[PDB]
């Protein structure tokens, strides 16, 4: 929604994305993008870097290191 309401990082529009896409291709990281997911929405901390993402387990070192690489791809590109 375009209600800025809560700070919900661009982690979570990219952990929703990858998650609706792996539920229609049949991706097994569905499961992996769901709990990391959960994990942000009961987080009052808008996860900027992976690092802030690091410190939830619920997510795992590869989760906040994709998260982390996107966040400096998109920032470079503009858009992705």
């Given at each position: 929604?375009?209600?800025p309401?809560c700070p919900n ?37 808008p ?34």
């Open positions: 929604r375009p209600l309401v990082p661009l982690f979570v529009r990219w952990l929703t994305e990858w998650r609706d896409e792996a539920a229609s291709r049949g991706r097994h990281t569905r499961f992996v993008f769901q709990k990391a997911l959960r994990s942000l929405q009961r987080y009052p901390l996860l900027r870097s992976g690092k802030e993402a690091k410190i939830l387990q619920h997510f795992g070192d590869r989760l906040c290191r994709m998260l982390d690489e996107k966040l400096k791809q998109h920032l470079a590109s503009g858009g992705d």
